[PDB]
Design an enzyme around this catalytic site. Sequence first.
Site, PDB file in Angstrom:
ATOM      1  N   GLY B  28       0.793  -1.192   0.000  1.00 55.23           N
ATOM      2  CA  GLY B  28       0.000   0.000   0.000  1.00 55.23           C
ATOM      3  C   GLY B  28       0.853   1.283   0.000  1.00 55.23           C
ATOM      4  N   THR B  29       0.257   2.486  -0.059  1.00 55.76           N
ATOM      5  CA  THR B  29       0.948   3.807   0.180  1.00 55.76           C
ATOM      6  C   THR B  29       0.788   4.162   1.562  1.00 55.76           C
ATOM      7  OG1 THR B  29      -1.033   4.853  -0.863  1.00 55.76           O
ATOM      8  CG2 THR B  29       1.029   4.895  -2.090  1.00 55.76           C
ATOM      9  N   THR B  30       1.744   4.905   2.094  1.00 49.44           N
ATOM     10  CA  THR B  30       1.695   5.491   3.387  1.00 49.44           C
ATOM     11  C   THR B  30       0.421   6.199   3.682  1.00 49.44           C
ATOM     12  OG1 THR B  30       3.931   5.896   3.153  1.00 49.44           O
ATOM     13  CG2 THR B  30       2.953   6.601   5.188  1.00 49.44           C
ATOM     14  N   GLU B  45      -0.937   9.531   1.104  1.00 50.30           N
ATOM     15  CA  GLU B  45      -0.167   9.699  -0.081  1.00 50.30           C
ATOM     16  C   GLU B  45      -0.947   9.004  -1.170  1.00 50.30           C
ATOM     17  OE1 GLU B  45       3.650   7.843  -2.210  1.00 50.30           O
ATOM     18  OE2 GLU B  45       3.958   7.883  -0.001  1.00 50.30           O
TER      19      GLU B  45
END
Lengths: 231, 242, 249, 244, 53, 249, 237, 242
Positions: B28-30, B45
């Site tokens: 995943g993204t932060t 993000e």
Amino acid sequence: NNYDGDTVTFSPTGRLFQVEYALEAIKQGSVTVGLRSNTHAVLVALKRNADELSSYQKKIIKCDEHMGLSLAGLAPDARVLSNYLRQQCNYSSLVFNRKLAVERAGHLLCDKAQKNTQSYGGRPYGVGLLIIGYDKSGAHLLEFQPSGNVTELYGTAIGARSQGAKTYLERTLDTFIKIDGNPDELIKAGVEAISQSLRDESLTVDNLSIAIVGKDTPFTIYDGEAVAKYI
Amino acid sequence: GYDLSNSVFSPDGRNFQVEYAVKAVENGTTSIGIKCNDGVVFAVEKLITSKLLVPQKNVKIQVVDRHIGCVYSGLIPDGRHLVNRGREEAASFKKLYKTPIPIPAFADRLGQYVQAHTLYNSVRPFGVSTIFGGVDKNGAHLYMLEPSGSYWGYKGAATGKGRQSAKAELEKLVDHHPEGLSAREAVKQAAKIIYLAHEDNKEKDFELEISWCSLSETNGLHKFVKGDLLQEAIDFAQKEIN
Amino acid sequence: FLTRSEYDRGVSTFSPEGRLFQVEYSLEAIKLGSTAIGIATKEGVVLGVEKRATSPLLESDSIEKIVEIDRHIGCAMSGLTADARSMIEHARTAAVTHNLYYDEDINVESLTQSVCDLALRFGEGASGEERLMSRPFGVALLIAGHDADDGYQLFHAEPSGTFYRYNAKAIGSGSEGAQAELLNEWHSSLTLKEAELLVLKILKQVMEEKLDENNAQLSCITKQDGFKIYDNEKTAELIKELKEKEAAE
Amino acid sequence: GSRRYDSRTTIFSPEGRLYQVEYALESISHAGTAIGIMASDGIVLAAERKVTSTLLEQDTSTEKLYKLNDKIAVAVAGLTADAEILINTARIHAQNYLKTYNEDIPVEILVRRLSDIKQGYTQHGGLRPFGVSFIYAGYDDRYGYQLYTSNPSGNYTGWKAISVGANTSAAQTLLQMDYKDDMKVDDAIELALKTLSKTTDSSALTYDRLEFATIRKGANDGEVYQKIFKPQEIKDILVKTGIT
Amino acid sequence: VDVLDPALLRSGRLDRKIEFPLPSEDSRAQILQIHSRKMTTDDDINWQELARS
Amino acid sequence: TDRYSFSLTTFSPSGKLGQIDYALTAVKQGVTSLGIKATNGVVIATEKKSSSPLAMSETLSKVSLLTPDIGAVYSGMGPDYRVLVDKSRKVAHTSYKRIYGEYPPTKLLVSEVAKIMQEATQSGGVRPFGVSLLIAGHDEFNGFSLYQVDPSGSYFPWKATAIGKGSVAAKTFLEKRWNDELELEDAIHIALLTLKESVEGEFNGDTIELAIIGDENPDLLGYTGIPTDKGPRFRKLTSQEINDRLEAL
Amino acid sequence: YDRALSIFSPDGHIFQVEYALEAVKRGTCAVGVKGKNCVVLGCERRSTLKLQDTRITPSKVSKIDSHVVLSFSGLNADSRILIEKARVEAQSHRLTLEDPVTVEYLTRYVAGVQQRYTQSGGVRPFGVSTLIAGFDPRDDEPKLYQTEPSGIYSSWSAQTIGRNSKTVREFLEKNYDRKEPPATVEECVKLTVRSLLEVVQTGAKNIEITVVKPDSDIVALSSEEINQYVTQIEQEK
Amino acid sequence: AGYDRHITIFSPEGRLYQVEYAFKATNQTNINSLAVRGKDCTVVISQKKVPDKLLDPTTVSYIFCISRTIGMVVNGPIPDARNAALRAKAEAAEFRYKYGYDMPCDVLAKRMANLSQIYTQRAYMRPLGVILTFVSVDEELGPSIYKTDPAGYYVGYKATATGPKQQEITTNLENHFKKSKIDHINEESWEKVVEFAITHMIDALGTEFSKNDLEVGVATKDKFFTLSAENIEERLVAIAEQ
């Protein structure tokens, strides 16, 4: 087969391979390109005949008089999803007396794939849809993947040789946004966009399928001697 | 074989499936959650994949009720099912008890749903981590929910790829401010550590989305930070990392 | 037998192909199909089927693969014909349903689309429709028909759930040999007795006995006479007048 | 998940044949012998217990012998748990027939009904069979005394002499040589005893290891007396025939 | 690199771990010109055209 | 979903059913219990066991009450016994104290519980309960009766039997110790003496649980002033009564 | 349970239909030959086993209506489920549409019955093949049909199914004529006995013959009768 | 078959290995408890550990309030802890409704127990990997501790401990009641039972404790309370001044 033949499993990697497999539905798919400006949407789908005695099987389905979807991938899967979109489209007309919100309908679609990817004996759908329409917020292009990702883009493709279209759209991105009120040009930009994505398969007056939706023009699919004006 | 599913058990206390779900969330993204004095402030993000995209037109922070922010990482489609489920459960509670759901109550509910998906042969445990909070009348609370159905209270939580950069910097923020900080002052802090969490993710370009639920800015509703307030945050962070 | 198949444990499972394996197998049961030839013209459509004699003690004039859906639509079955026992009832029901609700002759394309929606309903329970099948049908149709809106149309319906409108198509075992000849000999400037005699030309090549009316059957769909099954006495005449003109060579 | 671990035991073999049916037939020759011998005046049912211990109570036991109704009793050989079930299914069927027509069931009808029940379990549902074999002794007026065996597949054939359970082949050979078309009941009792003395799977053959029961026309006024004997009446007729 | 021993994950053995990526737009165009230098071409070649396609 | 409705008990290729062969071994990996049937009464006696010595043993029951005339005692699994005792009672009330408005005879109760085991042998999603039960009880018309229900679902009446791990040795001891008339006073001394050869453990009333289906006790009646009914014929023996008998061995 | 016992095969079949045909091969042999005004189904019974009650036990020819007989080969146990469906349909036809069933309608029904247990989940096909013969009512054409476990139905002039059917089928090409049946009922019976004596052999007691004449007359000829018919064939041969 | 312990099926040894695998997974939080019966109270002490500074310490908890009389202390994973907390709550509402008095602890031991059996009898349900200690004060049975375990086996206790290092505690409790020669400490007030409990735990685990590393729950007569870190701080000083 280690973790490959089962949609319920995982996967030491953290993917699963069943989703990746369904993404090959896109890959073996025939090219279709959608691009929108701000006043008009256009889907340009490259139909495919089986042989010469045969006709071509349409690749754009009128979902509404302001919405359309075109398939890339498996033909039985596409027919399931097109019915569903229509039912939820007529529900909104009946119940809320309202054109269906394009952005919302993308999440309804998402959850239908999700529940066949949760339970065993289900399948991930092997069709990715490009759904254009014109509502109260203007022109829209939704991109549907097998995973269930919904994204709104200025102009996109899916199919075989999708890469070659997408590098075309990066050039001509700033062109098509700025032509507005002249639906004719955006169609010309779509004829050229899919020319790049050919394997010398040419474009005939029954292979190329244009459909548009406007500010003032309902959803319409052109084929016949209508298309030849653009060819 | 005993390393393949959820209903299996193995004599190491491992149940290999569920651990594999964390590996999904790790792609995943932060996403961070800053717990402030007045509320909660999320930011995510959002990767810009291509210049073909229509910008600021995908929301990865979805509201549940009118007062519980929800932002998730892992499998994007899979997460959308979990949020829909917590919008059903919120709506059932709102009817039956005629108040907006408490956050320790919202916690019980979601918690149960993912736990469920480790006890049947025919289901897969969801691979998403959620971060959810808001203001209720017992005060602001924040919870992070593991794909294993584990959760705790949190003065700052994170998940995502850049959970490495983000965590160390959250320690820094409770040692900056161990008596807490304002929800207004924390907009600029969410910008700063989302930007730093893109140095584990610098193969692309990204867009920052920030949302808040704080009592003292939004009257206890889950709103988005938008317009000129949002670009002040972008500039602040941008100049520190340069 | 025992040909490498990596996956095929689910009845819908993938497959590095990008498409299901089970659907593919269904199409490989139509190459064991007794050969059905169909030439569509703009003056009519001819459905010819080899009845298929198995024995001299089998009565081969009692058995036939011409099946009536209604008076304006005819249909021909090739493949595993037990599977077509269930679908052909369904299709006849369907037509009738349309005549009840709308009091109108149903489109050929619409009717074709309906048994395709039927064709796709293999599964263990999923989607909008409750699965009641569990293995895919292993049978393909040639729905011919005549409507007064789009004229003569002829469709090849797949166990896949796909329909391609053809201008002439032969399916069955001798499919490969048939479609070489159709490509050269077909055109849109044909007349009804030159097509009729074309059905018997191509039937002659995929014949595994010899050609006579005790193992071959013709049937038509005509606008003003409807769907008519040609009897054997009539069938005989044409087979002999082929044999007169092939002896003028 | 579940489909993965599914046994699939109700599919045909390459032979067209059902492995679990055969496996059931294999296991009943591990249970005791039950024999039926049809006399012209009655039917003798003679069963050899598959258990015996001096600490056993085998005196209230009717662990092979059951009354389905007062005119048709069965001899049971196999897995007793599965068998108990069918026994109360059968009672329920007899009484149903009796409710609706107010006339006792003929032997032809009740044997066809149990058999169809078995047929269902091997035919579908992914279950394993009910591994039981019944010897039906019954009287009806329409066809008289009728003797019957059914097997776990669910197929029946009538017999004049039959053996089930342990040493089926053996008992059959013997029966064929010492049968006569018409006998008295006593001569039958004797023969019933004699076959079990040569087939017994322990050397010794005793009363406490015999369950033994008849249906006799020694009831006057053309009625049939179902008698399940007490083991002390078995002891005397076993000394009569001179075995012990 | 998925077939290596856990005693070669570790630094002290091969410390720096370089991946060779599938080519890029700029990279493809270059590659083509390096082979084609060896043989004779005409002067109507465009190395970008071949590299888009 | 779920699709566990296929049998998980199947015939074995060699015959016999594997899962019930496994369950019976398990009964001889358990605690030890025995029952002796006397002329004028019945006794069952078993060992009480717990993880640690600091656990209680008065809050645990391995002689359990079905009816006021019928107790059960097990050898096998604790968890699996607990549920079936409850189901034994539930079916004894619903099918005999509602339809005859009284308690069932011992033979009739045996048979009911044998069906419950049976559907744990048939069908999916069950595996056999791994217990062997003794059901000793008294009814008026056949007097004192002792049974054994096994993992398989058959029942057996016995004159004296034991179950558990010390079983093979215990029935040999009781073979010489059984007599044609044994009094209940005498039997009590017998069962203790047998289970003393079978138990090493500190031998008090607090570790040996004794229950008799002896004779009726009008003091456990719970009411007076009705002379028509009489009290429980079951009577659970607490630690004090067993302590006198410890000393009399 | 809703899991498949029918798994599609890449061969262009289903395994279980091929397995179901073998099961039919291993079954007792049935012959059908129709005259001009009769039908004749001869069937082998294994009466080789001794002390068999034959009185009380049903023949392997079952009447399903007053003018439609069904004979069968393959799994004997399984067959009885088909016979109970078919008797039930026969009444339903009288109830709702009036008149007795036609042989064709009943054959089609049987065809759809065996078919169903192929295509449905949770069930395996029946490995049972039927010979359905009989008369239509108001009519005097013998109509002789065969249905097979593939759920495929056929009309036949004469047919045989069961064990070593091929040996009898070659005989039937050569001694029965497509053009002319034998016209007396008696000769038709003896043509079928004469055929039966190829594989069945071993005396005339394993032969059973049911003869049906129109107007609803199903009678089955006893052993004694057969004995006389067989001896004639014996002497003439 | 190679399937023989994927489902709850006996082995050649006649055993349920599947169920045993649950007991090897009751020790993953690695928390330890000890619970002792006073004379007119019950006291249960458990360890608290937080792995980071960035959690909220209050919410981290293992002692779950079920009835207002029945506390419940959980050893093993917190996902299955919660599912166990919920089911129990459900039965507690259920008993009052139909029988018209509050649920007895004794009866909660058998219901939750029988429910455990049902999870090891379905061939598609994975048992909870939580050992529950139920503490109560009943008037009809007096102060009691009932321990259920993932099998559904249970017995009563005079005192009991649970946890991976729980052998050590067994030594302290055995030695202690050996000297007293009775099953319960003769002490008429809950205060000095909290004082005793902590002392055996300091001896056994070998480490002295602090206010923020304890978690204490106390069952008195007719109410169940948990003490906060402040009330626990008072107790610790008074062990030193004995």
